[PDB]
């Protein structure tokens, strides 16, 4: 978990396609 | 689980598709 | 689960089109 | 579960047209 | 968990397309 | 766990295709 969640369910060679990803403090002091 | 949910249920080779993706504090102190 | 919650049900290779994915505390302190 | 609700079914490769997606507290402390 | 989250269930050799990947203080003080 | 999460699960010999894979201080001062 964390930031964006990119669930894909496939019994398949998929891809996640993730561009111009940018992590801001994706996790905070506490969590 | 977190920021942006991608849920997809599918028996084939799929990709998700994210762009501009900024995570702005996507978690908090307590979670 | 957490921000936008995509759930796409299909027996064929989709595609989740987010753009402009903005997460602002998409998670608060509790959860 | 959580924010935008996308709940789409069908029998093939559809796609979730999300933009200006902006995820402001979508859970709150207690959820 | 961390940043984005890449959640691909498959039973073939898939692989992660990660493109302008920027970790921008993923991990707070806390967590 | 830290920066960019690579979730992948599948019985074959997959590849994380990382491209401009920058980490800024991926790791708080606290963690």
Do not use: C, D, R
């Amino acid at each position: 978990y964390g930031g964006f969640m990119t669930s894909e369910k496939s019994q398949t060679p998929l891809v996640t396609l993730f561009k111009n990803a940018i992590i801001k403090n994706a996790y905070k002091k506490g969590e």
